Amino acid sequence: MKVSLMAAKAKNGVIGCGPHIPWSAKGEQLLFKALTYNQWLLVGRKTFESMGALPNRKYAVVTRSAWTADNDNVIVFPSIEEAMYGLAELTDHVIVSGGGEIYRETLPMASTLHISTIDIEPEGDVFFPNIPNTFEVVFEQHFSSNINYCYQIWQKG
Amino acid sequence: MKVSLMAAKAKNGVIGCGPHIPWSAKGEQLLFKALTYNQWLLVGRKTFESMGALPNRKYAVVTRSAWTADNDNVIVFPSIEEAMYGLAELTDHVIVSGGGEIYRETLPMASTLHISTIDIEPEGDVFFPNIPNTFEVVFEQHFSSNINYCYQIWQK
Ligand SMILES: NC(=O)c1ccc[n+]([C@@H]2O[C@H](COP(=O)([O-])OP(=O)(O)OC[C@H]3O[C@@H](n4cnc5c(N)ncnc54)[C@H](OP(=O)(O)O)[C@@H]3O)[C@@H](O)[C@H]2O)c1
Ligand SMILES: NC(=O)c1ccc[n+]([C@@H]2O[C@H](COP(=O)([O-])OP(=O)(O)OC[C@H]3O[C@@H](n4cnc5c(N)ncnc54)[C@H](OP(=O)(O)O)[C@@H]3O)[C@@H](O)[C@H]2O)c1
Ligand SMILES: CCc1nc(N)nc(N)c1C#C[C@H](C)c1cc(-c2ccc(C(N)=O)cc2)ccc1Cl
Ligand SMILES: CCc1nc(N)nc(N)c1C#C[C@H](C)c1cc(-c2ccc(C(N)=O)cc2)ccc1Cl
Numbered sequence: 001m002k003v004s005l006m007a008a009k010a011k012n013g014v015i016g017c018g019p020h021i022p023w024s025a026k027g028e029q030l031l032f033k034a035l036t037y038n039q040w041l042l043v044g045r046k047t048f049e050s051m052g053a054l055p056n057r058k059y060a061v062v063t064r065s066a067w068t069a070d071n072d073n074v075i076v077f078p079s080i081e082e083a084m085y086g087l088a089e090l091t092d093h094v095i096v097s098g099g100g101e102i103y104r105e106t107l108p109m110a111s112t113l114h115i116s117t118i119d120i121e122p123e124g125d126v127f128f129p130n131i132p133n134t135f136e137v138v139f140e141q142h143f144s145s146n147i148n149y150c151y152q153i154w155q156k157g
Numbered sequence: 158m159k160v161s162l163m164a165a166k167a168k169n170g171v172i173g174c175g176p177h178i179p180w181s182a183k184g185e186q187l188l189f190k191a192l193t194y195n196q197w198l199l200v201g202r203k204t205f206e207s208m209g210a211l212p213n214r215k216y217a218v219v220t221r222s223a224w225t226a227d228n229d230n231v232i233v234f235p236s237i238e239e240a241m242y243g244l245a246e247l248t249d250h251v252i253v254s255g256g257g258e259i260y261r262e263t264l265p266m267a268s269t270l271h272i273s274t275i276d277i278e279p280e281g282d283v284f285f286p287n288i289p290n291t292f293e294v295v296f297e298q299h300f301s302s303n304i305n306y307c308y309q310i311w312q313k
Pocket of ligand 3: 006007008021028029031032047050051054097098114115116
């Protein structure tokens with residue numbers, strides 16, 4: 001099973017401010033919707049609660065508590081290793097879609113990264129990890145918008 | 158100026174049947190939307206008439222006749238050479254978005270290709286060109302849908 005990771009980060013590394021993503025970049029949500037369409041997503045419990053079970057995707061959520069989802073489109077796991085093992089029975093591909101914690105915990109498992117960098121430097125208390133040099137950019141495209149953004153695909157060599 | 162090209166082709170190479178794309182692969186249009194957002198596109202006159210002048214894009218359209226367009230976001234050019242030369246003054250990047258004829262005439266100038274292959278072999282009279290071996294795939298992702306599709310990005 002292949003693990004991808006999709007994230008949007010501000011120029012200063014911020015990805016979150018409390019339970020909110022602290023920018024609104026017109027156009028960027030299209031990439032996220034387009035690349036995740038009918039995909040399996042792996043998210044942390046907090047991210048899942050902020051985003052919800054959006055239509056046309058399937059969800060693996062991890063929690064350390066007895067927390068549960070209300071939805072036969074979501075599988076809840078007690079660990080990332082269990083989620084990975086369970087997902088590999090259902091699909092050959094999962095896209096890690098966030099939580100700062102989940103990103104830190106799964107970045108060494110990822111073999112391709114979908115990284116949108118937003119031309120803004122907001123306040124926030126949740127950050128994206130530094131991208132290790134195990135990965136290289138293989139595609140990049142710039143977008144002008146109300147807030148500009150740059151989409152890069154990174155591959156593990 | 159950078160030239161990209163983006164297309165959806167069936168597994169038998171068909172991209173069109175008359176004025177129509179001969180399939181509906183639910184979700185694939187999202188890729189096209191995402192990659193063309195606030196971009197300049199280059200299209201042939203027939204493809205432009207088949208498509209809306211959809212929002213948040215600017216359209217260079219080529220024709221050999223007297224055809225013209227109302228929409229403020231469209232510039233009409235008499236040839237590909239003139240479109241390319243005039244686009245270079247207007248933008249840093251154009252995405253060639255089709256016409257079989259337009260794809261044939263512009264594939265040699267593209268440096269990256271966005272290619273969605275649709276899990277179908279329909280009837281049609283317009284085909285995508287042979288991709289030269291100067292291009293290689295740098296990214297690939299499969300999608301399951303009513304008709305499955307595979308998204309590949311090629312770099313020259
Ligand atoms: N810009 C972006 O790309 C993007 C994307 C997504 C989210 N965000 C932002 O990121 C922030 C949320 O990130 P976060 O780090 O606070 O939370 P998170 O990663 O979304 O979720 C953390 C929770 O997941 C569970 N968890 C984490 N690791 C686990 C493990 N190894 N085993 C079992 N359960 C595990 C725990 O759930 P329990 O507490 O239930 O035990 C933990 O509290 C928000 O601000 C959101 O807006 C940004
Ligand atoms: N699946 C996909 O990725 C996709 C994408 C787009 C379109 N399509 C399909 O492709 C089909 C249309 O393709 P097509 O090849 O018939 O038409 P097209 O390439 O879209 O347009 C051809 C027209 O463009 C103009 N043109 C072409 N070369 C020119 C040049 N060098 N200088 C000036 N004008 C030039 C001419 O317009 P005039 O006739 O006005 O002189 C020509 O008739 C449709 O079926 C459509 O559904 C598929
Ligand atoms: C578009 C942001 C983004 N970009 C890239 N590149 N990668 C990413 N991971 C994310 C993300 C995210 C989290 C998961 C999220 C998403 C949503 C949400 C809800 C509805 C829509 C929609 N427009 O329908 C879009 C997004 C809400 C809360 C959160 Cl927390
Ligand atoms: C989306 C298919 C596609 N995929 C990839 N990968 N590359 C491409 N070039 C195209 C294309 C195309 C032509 C230009 C086209 C587009 C549209 C159209 C229809 C609906 C919407 C929408 N859903 O709002 C947006 C665009 C209609 C007719 C045509 Cl003839």
